[PDB]
Enzyme design. Structure first.
Site, short mmCIF file in Angstrom:
data_model
loop_
_atom_site.label_atom_id
_atom_site.label_comp_id
_atom_site.label_asym_id
_atom_site.label_seq_id
_atom_site.Cartn_x
_atom_site.Cartn_y
_atom_site.Cartn_z
N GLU A 1 42.19 8.84 44.26
CA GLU A 1 41.57 10.00 43.63
C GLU A 1 40.13 10.31 44.06
OE1 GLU A 1 42.38 10.44 39.48
OE2 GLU A 1 44.52 10.64 39.88
N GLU B 1 51.17 9.21 41.37
CA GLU B 1 51.00 9.21 39.93
C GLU B 1 51.63 10.44 39.28
OE1 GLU B 1 47.25 8.51 38.21
OE2 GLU B 1 46.57 7.10 39.75
#
Length: 322
Positions: A143, A251
């Protein structure tokens, strides 16, 4: 070396396993207090469920306390144990440096954290883990966000370094804006990392709430469209097809108390199968308590998200798509 299903097809849909990246504000922190490593029971349960793919978060700060210091023996030993247990249970692990483009709060590529430092730790890690049968690959960074144009150069620096020591392991490359699937074509329009081994896969994350965060706050989780997962994945899938690249949805996750998120998860996993694209659910393993998203069983009882998953485990894929 991608994991296969016993009945045929690929092990596309797996699970994120806690909890070595927990409480990252507390460093180094203490194993067993602030963060947690999984045990044989966790690997055994997921394998029993037909799951052979695991993404495992850890943080840089816990494998290297400072840039002038070496790797922490115990933390590597804890990571080795994870790979060992995974392998024994027929699973393969994606190791995820869960660092958001930062080291001790500083941007990788800043003067305090040179590209050189990030390349070194991964080269040292690749040296430690190279050839392990439970290792699928290195998700070199989780991320990245707000990196001010730093991230692409950091990614290439780590990839170059890993390949000096390990030409066989897969590398997973995430993108800016928290690796959002929906925003991928705008934020990573021309994102391209070089790998002579042809062992790279691009990885986005995808949540169903209004702000794309996966927090699932009350105001942002009303009115979830059952096709929102497909709609947010499509931009990523089409970007990958256009650039001829392989993808991974690292995710995604839903709270237990939102029936609409359940529908969105079903349609999402169906779409990923149609493209032979793998995924990892957020999340399972130790230390989650009654977290609504968590897929870890309670009192021996399978969670609704695990039950939702099982329909989608079968496929006839021979390669990672799209």
């Amino acid at each position: 070396d991608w994991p296969v299903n016993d009945e045929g097809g690929l092990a596309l849909h797996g699970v994120n396993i806690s909890g070595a990246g927990f409480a990252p504000h507390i460093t180094p922190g203490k194993n067993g207090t602030h963060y947690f490593y999984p045990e044989k029971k966790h690997f055994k349960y997921y394998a029993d469920q037909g799951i052979r793919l695991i993404r495992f978060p850890f943080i840089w700060e816990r494998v290297q306390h400072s840039l002038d210091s070496g790797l922490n023996f115990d933390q590597i030993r804890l990571l080795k144990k994870t790979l060992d247990l995974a392998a024994q249970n027929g699973q393969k692990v994606i190791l995820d440096m869960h660092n958001y483009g930062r080291y001790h709060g500083e941007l990788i590529g800043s003067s305090k954290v040179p590209y050189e430092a990030y390349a070194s730790v991964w080269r040292k890690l690749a040296e430690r883990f190279k050839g392990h049968p439970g290792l699928l690959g290195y998700d070199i960074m989780n991320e990245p966000h707000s990196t001010v144009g730093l991230w692409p150069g950091a990614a290439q620096a780590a990839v170059d370094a890993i390949r000096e020591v390990d030409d066989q392991t897969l590398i997973f490359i995430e993108g800016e804006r928290w690796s959002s699937a929906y925003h991928w074509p705008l934020v990573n329009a021309n994102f391209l990392i070089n790998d002579p081994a042809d062992r790279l896969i691009y990885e986005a994350h995808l949540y169903f709430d209004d702000d794309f965060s996966g927090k699932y706050m009350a105001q942002t989780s009303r009115n979830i469209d059952p096709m929102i997962g497909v709609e947010r994945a499509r931009p990523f899938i089409e970007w990958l097809q256009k650039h001829g690249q392989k993808g991974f949805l690292g995710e995604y996750g839903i709270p237990d108390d939102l029936p609409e998120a359940a529908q969105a998860m079903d349609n999402l996993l169906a779409y990923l199968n149609d493209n032979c694209v793998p995924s990892a659910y957020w999340a399972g393993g130790p230390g989650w308590g009654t977290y609504k998203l968590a897929i870890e069983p309670r009192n021996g009882k399978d969670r609704p998200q695990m039950e939702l998953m099982r329909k989608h485990l079968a496929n006839d894929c021979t390669a990672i798509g799209p």
